[PDB]
Symmetry: D2
């Protein structure tokens, strides 16, 4: 039900060490005259966000590994600004009988010579999956804010919050956003 950091933008310019520092640096050198540049990074970035100066948040890219189900991943897949890879600052009773029954038929179909990509189709949407999700920091911002809101279903909320915790760790922007 979780997420881990796989990869993130690392700058190689002098005096810019992290992804967040590049975003703040792009903000500042866009408008060198701006008195706004004299703010803390989180102060500056609050305004960049408020002004819709989104391109500074597209200098950075992060990728996360998500562990979720096939039902939720299909929903996550709909955030088309992201890039995905897939691999091969009573109710809980009847499901378990059916799930065990499906995996039995799955494991035996493979053993009987049926390949993989045909056997896959009998698996339920509750089947766990692992995907990479990659996108700019701009896109992570609006995915997280949306999918941690009331209007999205519980298991997606949990998934997005796992992402939120990693985001907060890597990124002044989490304070700018009042997260």
């Amino acid at each position: 039900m979780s997420a881990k950091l796989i990869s993130v933008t690392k700058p190689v310019v002098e005096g810019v060490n992290t992804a967040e520092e590049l975003i703040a640096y792009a903000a500042r050198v866009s408008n060198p005259e701006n008195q706004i540049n004299n703010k803390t990074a989180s102060g500056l970035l609050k305004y960049c966000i408020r002004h819709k100066h989104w391109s500074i948040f597209e200098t950075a890219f992060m990728t996360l590994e998500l562990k979720t189900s096939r039902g939720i991943a299909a929903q996550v897949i709909r955030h088309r600004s992201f890039h995905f890879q897939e691999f091969s600052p009573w109710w809980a009773t009847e499901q378990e009988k059916l799930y065990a029954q499906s995996m039995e038929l799955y494991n035996k179909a493979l053993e009987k010579g049926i390949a993989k990509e045909c056997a896959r189709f009998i698996l339920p949407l509750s089947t766990p999956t692992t995907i990479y999700m990659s996108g700019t920091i701009r896109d992570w911002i609006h995915y997280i804010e949306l999918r941690t809101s009331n209007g999205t279903q519980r298991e997606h909320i949990d998934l997005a919050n796992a992402c939120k915790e990693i985001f907060i760790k890597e990124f002044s922007i989490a304070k700018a956003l009042d997260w």
Copy 2:
């Protein structure tokens, strides 16, 4: 296992009647001097394609309704240049026993008060689905060429070919592409 036309680009400029005619017209007025403009539309467009002048094929947008399974739709969903909407020129024996068993549990779970979005999760990937797929003619071109190739699985090939037939009907480009 099929597709239908739902909607397509209709120009409102004078002497340009169809989506294909706008693409050919954009090609021609991009470079009014070009002796290439004296070709038939399919002759002109063959070259636009060959030269990678892709933006003329992004003046037109088409949308199709696809009937397929949840397994295939999840794969189709990965063509992220497209926009999707979802709604609520022995092996064939064991599957049918399990599928009937899942739908029984699905129908009864709803009848027992479980809602919908929880019951959904027990459904197999073989479950039929209806989606809209919308994108520019450029994107339709490269989706169709890819997903009608050897390297993609049979049921996706059939789906892409249903799309191909509609494309051929609406669009000189089908001849330019040697379809």
Copy 3:
């Protein structure tokens, strides 16, 4: 300065004759319980971020502006474009421009290629471009570029697009309180 409609989405299915009717149709077969007004349904869809019903429609506009403003418009990367080939301050803008066009003409006359001569043209030089995007993309482009912060010439162009948007999508406009 101006905008003209070139092309728009038209549904081919029975009972749905306009791009917006298709948008509304999509929002309807998504309402088990909310059957309020037509524009009220769309407003509700917009408010809950169900964007994809608005990505079923697509519209192209021809914009007439300067190269300088066009470069800014090009930054709205969800859109697809097509380009084609061809006070005292107000007084001295006219002399340089005329003097720039004079040399431009001379160079073309004296054999020099179109793409080399183009480089002497100022950012104020007129250009016409197609801008194509889903209805979703138009909403946030117009929204953004009509609000203070963007420069005057750009505000004017975005207000020209908004006028066309409202004619084609009168029910979304109502949902957004957009008026002529």
Copy 4:
């Protein structure tokens, strides 16, 4: 004319220390049977259109070019950009430019806003921009813009990017027969 690397993807997981190692890692946990050379695996991935392994890496380059070429580069809409503020034919290009810069300076000195004065600047005027995209997007940008058909100044800029790409992704370059 030139390009400089600003930033690139670095994996944080054990055993994978570069963007390309992560790309290669992704292509490996996708090979049940093909275990040929490292660059040979990627070539195979590229040939079967498995693009998404190449969308795990992302790189930013700072480009120095003219406004005219930058407007063309802006058309590669899969990329994200950032802009910042600040023969006889060769003889008369120098006079107009100097004369355009003279008035530009005068206008700024006499109170006129930066955004109004900018419009008298020719398309040849220097600019620096960030260009950020997945490794996939770089491949087809470089591929396209290094080939005959695109104009000289643009070919030169795309060859400057290719040089940096090859330094960072030596194994993809090998897979594509790209050399310095």
